[PDB]
Design a protein around this nucleic acid. Sequence first.
RNA 1: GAGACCGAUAGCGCACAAGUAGAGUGAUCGAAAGAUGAAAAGCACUUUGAAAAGAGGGUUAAAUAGCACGUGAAAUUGUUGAAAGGGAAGCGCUUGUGACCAGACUUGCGCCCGGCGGAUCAUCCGGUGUUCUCACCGGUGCACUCCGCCGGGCUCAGGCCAG
RNA 2: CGGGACCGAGGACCGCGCUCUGCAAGGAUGCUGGCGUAAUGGUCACCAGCGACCCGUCUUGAAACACGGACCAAGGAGUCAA
RNA 3: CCCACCCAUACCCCGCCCUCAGGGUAGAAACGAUGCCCUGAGGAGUAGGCGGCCGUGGAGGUCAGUGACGAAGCCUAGGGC
Lengths: 149, 126, 139, 52, 171, 150
Amino acid sequence: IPPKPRKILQLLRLRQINNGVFVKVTKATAEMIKIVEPWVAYGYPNLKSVRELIYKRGYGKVNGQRIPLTDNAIIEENLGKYGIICIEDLIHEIFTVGPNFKQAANFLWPFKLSNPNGGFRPRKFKHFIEGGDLGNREEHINALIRAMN
Amino acid sequence: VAAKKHVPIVKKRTKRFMRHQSDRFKCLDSAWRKPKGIDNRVRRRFKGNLAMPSIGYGSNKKTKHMMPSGHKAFLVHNVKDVELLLMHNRTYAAEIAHNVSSRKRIDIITRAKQLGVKVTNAKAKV
Amino acid sequence: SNVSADLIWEVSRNYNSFLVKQRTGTFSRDALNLTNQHSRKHAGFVNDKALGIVPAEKGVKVIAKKVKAANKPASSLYTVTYKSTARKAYKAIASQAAKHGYRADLRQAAVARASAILRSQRPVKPEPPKKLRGAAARR
Amino acid sequence: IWRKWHVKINQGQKRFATASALAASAVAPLLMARGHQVSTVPEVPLVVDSAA
Amino acid sequence: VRYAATEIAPTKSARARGSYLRVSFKNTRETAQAINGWKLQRALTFLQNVIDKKEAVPMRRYAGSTGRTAQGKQWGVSRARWPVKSAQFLIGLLKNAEANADAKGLDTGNLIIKHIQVNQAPKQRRRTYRAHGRINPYMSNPCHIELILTEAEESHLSSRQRGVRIRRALT
Amino acid sequence: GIDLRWKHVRSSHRKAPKSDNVYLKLLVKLYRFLARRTEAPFNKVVLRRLFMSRINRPPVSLSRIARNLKNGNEKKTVVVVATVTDDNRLLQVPKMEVAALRFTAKARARIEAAGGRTLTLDQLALEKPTGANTLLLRGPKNAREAVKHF
RNA sequence: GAGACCGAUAGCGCACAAGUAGAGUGAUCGAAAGAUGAAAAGCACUUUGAAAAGAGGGUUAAAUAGCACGUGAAAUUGUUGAAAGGGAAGCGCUUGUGACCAGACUUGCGCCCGGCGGAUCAUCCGGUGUUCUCACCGGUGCACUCCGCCGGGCUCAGGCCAG
RNA sequence: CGGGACCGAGGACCGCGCUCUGCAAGGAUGCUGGCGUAAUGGUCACCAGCGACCCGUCUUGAAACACGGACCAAGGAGUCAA
RNA sequence: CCCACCCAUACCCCGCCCUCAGGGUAGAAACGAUGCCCUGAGGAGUAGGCGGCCGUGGAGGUCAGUGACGAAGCCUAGGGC
C-alpha cells in the first residue's frame, strides 16, 4: 500500500480488513475517502444498519480500552456531558449527525465485521459501477452491512 | 482421598517435540534443539515439517502440574517428609524417592495411609 | 527498634532452614506453621503472635507464642494438650485463636489442622484388593 | 597462578557486617531459621557466668 | 557361563560351547542356519555329506558374488557351497553335546537342535604388505558357537445383550 | 493482520528498587501504601526517589539546605531523599528540621548542636503523612565527573 | 606440610620393569598400557575330546566376578519373537488394527431408629497457665446427658461413555 | 414460527432490569440409561488419505556452483591478567 | 450476463498460553504484597540487543536428607510433570 493511502487509512482508523467506521460528510473527509477508494467500500447507511451495528457490535473506548456497550451507565459516564446518556441517544446522534457527532463516533470503537454471507462479487477489487465492490455504492451499502453483520 | 474439584485437564499437545534429523542420526538425541541454519525448513516453518515449541502450547494455569487424578506430585524421602502433606491430601500426592529403602517405604506408606494422602508409587519394592 | 517481624520476613523470605522448594510448590517444616506453607500469613517463627498444632498420643497439642518472652525460648511457648471430644478441642482452639485478637486469620487453619490430626489418629480401614486387568497382567 | 585469588574488602564494610551478624545472633527466630536447636535455651543472647 | 537361550531348562537338554574358534564366521553362520531345528543324526549325516561334497550348504546372507550349483535346489536357491572347516567344527560340537546327553541319560535318537548360535569372536590381527610401502590388515574373523539340544515334542456384557441372549436361549 | 504504524511502548521508568536493602524494601512498602491511599503528590515523588539509584540521588549539603531555608522557609520540614553531607564552609548551622535517607556523622552532630532535628523517612511519614509544610530538596545532578566528560 | 587443582584420551611424555619399548647413520624423536575376589577359596572328582576346551559337579554372598577377569554404553553382529517390502527409506496431521499399559472406581459425610461398651457430658469448687477471659488438671455426672462400635432406613456427594 | 451444527469460560450474595409468588436478568442445569473395565484414555509397530528436497558453510541481491559429512563413544574452541 | 457452491494461518464469535498496559488490595479476620483479584489490547522474524530459566565439576551453609533391607552408573515396545 502506498504511504499516502496508508496514512489516510490510519487516520480513518481502518487498520484491519473488514473494519467499519462512521464518517460525517465534509469535503475534507470526502477527498480522503476518494483517495482511499481502491481499498474501501462506503455508502449511506440507514437507521436499521446504524442500530444493528451499534446494538450488536457496539464497543466504546473507555480509558483506551474496548468495552462492550451492555449498559447505559457506560454511555452516561463517557458521553453524559454532551447529553448522550443512553444507547438510543447514541444511535440518534450517529444517524442524524448531531452537534456531538465527533465525540460519539470517536467513542465508538471501530466495528469489526465478519466476512459477508453470500460473499462478494466475482471480481471484488473493481469499482462498484464496473461490477466490483470498491468505491461509493451509495444506498447499496446496507445490503453489505446485512451480509457482514 | 479424592482430589479437589477442578476444571477438566486439557493438554493442547500430547506428542513430544522431536529434534530435526534425530530420526536419521543416532548421534543426535531426540531432545529438542532449535534449528539455527538460515535455510532450515523447520526453522522457516514450511508446512508438513516438524512443529516448533512456543508459549502458545502452554497449559491451563489452574491445572498445571496436575496428574490425571487431579493431584500435584510432591517428592518425599521419609515420614517427616510425607507428614508435610497433612493439610494437602486433596491437592497433593506423595511420591517416594527412588533411592528410599523398602522398610522406610513401608513406613511412609503406612503414615500416608493414616494421613489420607495418595502415594503414586505405593506398589514399589513389594 | 531495629528488629521486627517484617524484618525477619524480609530476611528469611528467600531462604531459611525450614524451606522445602520443589517444582509443584514451596512448603515449610516450621512447627508454628499452620498448613506448612511458605507465606507471611503462616510463617510462625516470623510472626510475633503464632499458633502451632502437633499430634499427641491421643488428641492434639497446641503451642502459642508468648509476646513477653520472645528472647526466652525455653519459656516462650504456651502449650495446651487437648485430650477430649473433638468438638471441645475445636471450640477451645477457635476461642484461643479468635476471642482475644490472637491471629483471628488463622482460626480456620487451626481448626482444620486439629480436625486433620484427630482424623488421622483414627484407625485405618482395610483396602480393597488389587484386580488384575487385561491379558498380560491377568495371565 | 596470577589469577586474582584474594578479594580486598573495606574495613568499614567488614565491621558493618560483623555488627550486623552480631545483631542477628540476638534474634531467636533467626537462630531457628539458621537450623539451630535453641528451644531449650533459657535466654537469647545466652550469657554464662565467668566463674564457670 | 550363560547361554543366549535362557528359556530352556537344563534337566532334559544337552548343551555345547566353543569359543575363539579360528573358522570363518560367515560360513559357520550359514552352516548353523542350514542345520537349525534338525534332528541330531540328520544334522551329523548332512555335515558329513557337506565334508564329502555330497550335500551343500545354501548361502543366503553372506553370498555376494559366489558360485551356483545344482545341489541348492533342495533348498530352493542357486548359491550353495561346501564349508568343510565349519562342518568339522560343528560336528565336533554336536558330538560333544551328544556325549553330554549320554552322560545325562537322555534319549539320543529323540533329540533335536533347539538352539544353535554363532557370534563374532575378537578378530585375529595379521598384516599384509601392499604397493608403495603400505601395510594393510589381513585379519581373521573367528566365532563363538553355542548349541542346545532338546527332546522333540463373555464378561462385562450389557443388559440388552444379556436379554437378547436369554431370549435366543429360550427360543 | 492489524496495521500498527505506531508501537506500544513499555515503561522507561523504575517500578521497584534494584537495591536489596530490606529497610529500603520496608520504606518502599510504606510509601507504596501512602501513595495509593492519599491525594498528596509528595508521597508519589518520595516513592519515586526511593526507587531511584545513587547517581540519580546526589548528596545535599547543609549549606544548600541553609540557602533554601531563606525567605519564609525557616519553619518548613526539609525532605531530602539522599545523603545529607556536612559543609566546612558553613560556620553557623541554622536551626532546622530535616528528614533524610541517611545523614553523615558530622552533619547530624552539627544539626543537633545547632538545635534542629534529624528524622528518617518513616518518622517523616508518621509526622507528615501528607507532606504538609515541607521543603523538598535535591542535590546537583550534573555535578559529576562523567557528566562533565559527556 | 598443604590445596574450592586433575581423576587414567585427564593430570608431567611417564599412576605400570617410562625417558622404557620402538624408529633414525646421527643430532634426536618417543608411545601404548591401572581395577578378579574380603580371602585364590584361581574349579577336586566324573565324563567327551588329539588338544584347546565342553558338560556335569562345586568354591564364593555373588563365576549374571573364571587370571579374556569391578561396573560393562554406543556404533556393529548372531539367535528368538512380531511386522513391512511392485525402481529408496526416513518425517508431519488424522483415523483404524494388533500388542501393551497408566490412571479412575471399590465408597464417604450428615440425619432417624434399635442393640452394646464406657463415663475426659452441663453446672459448681480448688490449683495452674494464659491472649486476663479463655483453657487444662483433680472431686461432682448416675445415665432423656457425652464418646466410640455394630445392625437397619433416608438424603446428599461420588468413576467412564452416552440419550 | 420452525430445522441443524459447535461451544458451557465463571463459581456464596451484591449489578442493570423485566413479562415481578418469579424470570431466558453480571457465562448449564435438570432427568434418564448402559458399563464400572482396558469400555474411555495413553504408548509402540504397521497399513491407509493428504502433506513433506540433505544438513551446514560460503557467495552475492539471490540461486546455482563449490567445500565438509561411512558410523559410534570420549573430548574439543571469546579465557585470564593489567 | 446470471444463479448457486468449494476453501487460507485472511475476517467474525468462544476457550486457553504468554507479553504489555490500566485499576484494586492494612487502625491488616493478615500476604511465597517478589502474592492475589479485575479489565483491555497484542502475538512472523536473519544480523543485532536484552530478560528468565534448565543442565555439569567443585566450595560454605542447611535439609537432625537418601543408602549394603542396596548409593552412583547402565538398559527399558513401562508411566507422570
